[PDB]
């Protein structure tokens, strides 16, 4: 399997699935390095974030646990097709990149906070991460290039 991917067992259904311990992605389907990647992200900050403030709210008071619940909800809506990643990033990302539908542009290794870099480089083009924790908060990352 590709970097980070492992086989796992559904607790509710008993069917095999695949989990990536670098990106926190999970999926039923068997999974399908670059010098630079282009990613978008959706950030949900919390009270332990290095800077608990964003364009959305001056004092961010939600707990890490609450942030993770919000991230999980956004992932659910994205995966069901109820909402687009770009639309959720524009509305709800605690990063100024929200104004560009979450797009960060292209970057190489040795530029981003480490969990974010590692997730970004382990995604294939078009793939989305699970919840990725950094000192910034919790991210959903979409690799676009």
């Amino acid at each position: 399997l590709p970097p980070g991917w492992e086989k796992a067992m559904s607790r509710s259904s008993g069917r095999v699935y695949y989990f990536n311990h670098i990106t926190n992605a999970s999926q039923w389907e068997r999974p399908s390095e670059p010098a630079r990647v282009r990613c978008s992200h959706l950030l949900v900050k919390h009270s332990q974030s290095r800077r608990p403030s964003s364009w959305r709210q001056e004092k961010i008071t939600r707990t890490k646990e609450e942030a993770l619940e919000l991230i999980n909800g956004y992932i659910q809506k994205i995966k069901s097709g109820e909402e687009d990643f770009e639309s959720l990033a524009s509305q709800f990302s605690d990063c100024s990149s929200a104004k560009a539908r979450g797009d960060l542009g292209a970057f190489s290794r040795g530029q981003m906070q480490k969990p974010f870099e590692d997730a970004s480089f382990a995604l294939r083009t078009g793939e989305m991460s699970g919840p990725v924790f950094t000192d910034s908060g919790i991210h959903i990352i979409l690799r676009t290039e």
């Binding site: 992200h41 950030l43 990063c95 100024s96 990149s97 960060l104 040795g110 530029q111 981003m112 906070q113 480490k114 974010f116 950094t134 910034s136 991210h139």
Partner: peptide, 5 residues
């Protein structure tokens, strides 16, 4: 600046 090292 945001998730930049």
């Amino acid at each position: 600046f945001x998730x930049a090292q």
